Amino acid sequence: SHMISLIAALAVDRVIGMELPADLAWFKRNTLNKPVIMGRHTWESIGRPLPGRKNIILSSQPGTDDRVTWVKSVDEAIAACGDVPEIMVIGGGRVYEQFLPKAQKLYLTHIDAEVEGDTHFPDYEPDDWESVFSEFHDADAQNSHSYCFEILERR
Ligand SMILES: CC[C@H]1N=C(N)N=C(N)N1c1ccc(Cl)cc1
């Protein structure tokens, strides 16, 4: 039904960034075999296509890599995903803002960490978002901060 979802990691103040193992497993299991959409910035920091996913890059500037699909438009990106149940929007503060109005599902990782930056996740007023899932984790040997997975559905 071409549900668009957003998956993000947030620190306090909704601060986001590009460059915690458990969050990588969570990210990987919720995007596996789903087409993913991202900004230049986000593409540039991974370097590799994400395996077994249609990688789609949203940018005004022209393409530099044939392994991934390039688009200049929110609607060009959605159409490039084709007939799939769920589209995963994975990154760009700017890309998250462009796709929140078209999204029904949110996959958030709340990390108990201070981070200095002005890249913030978009305000999602609680009025029309319902929280359906919630999972806290202490810090352990592999994960340096406590963190909490959350999934919200649009009311
Ligand atoms: C640790 C971040 C990772 N984790 C979740 N849960 N969601 C994301 N959006 N992540 C992500 C962030 C930036 C880039 Cl470039 C790629 C992936």
From Swiss-Prot:
Residue positions annotated to bind NADP(+) are 9, 15-19, 41-42, 59-60, 72, 91-98
Q: GO biological process: any one?
A: tetrahydrofolate biosynthetic process
Q: Write the signal peptide boundaries.
A: none
Q: Which NCBIfam families match?
A: PRK10769.1
Which family does the record claim for this protein?
A: Belongs to the dihydrofolate reductase family.
The residues the record assigns to binding substrate are 7, 23, 48, 53, 109
The job of this chain, per UniProt, is described as: Key enzyme in folate metabolism. Catalyzes an essential reaction for de novo glycine and purine synthesis, and for DNA precursor synthesis.
Instruction: Report a single Gene Ontology molecular function.
Output: dihydrofolate reductase activity
What InterPro entries does the record tag this protein with? DHFR, DHFR-like_dom_sf, DHFR_CS, DHFR_dom
Q: In which pathway does it act?
A: Cofactor biosynthesis; tetrahydrofolate biosynthesis; 5,6,7,8-tetrahydrofolate from 7,8-dihydrofolate: step 1/1
Gene Ontology cellular-component terms for this entry are: cytosol
The broad enzyme category this protein falls into is oxidoreductase
Q: Which residues form the DHFR domain?
A: 3-154
Organism of origin: Escherichia coli O6:H1 (strain CFT073 / ATCC 700928 / UPEC)
Enzyme Commission number(s) of this protein: 1.5.1.3
Q: Which reaction does it catalyse?
A: (6S)-5,6,7,8-tetrahydrofolate + NADP(+) = 7,8-dihydrofolate + NADPH + H(+)
- Name it: Dihydrofolate reductase
List UniProt keywords, sorted A-Z.
Answer: NADP, One-carbon metabolism, Oxidoreductase
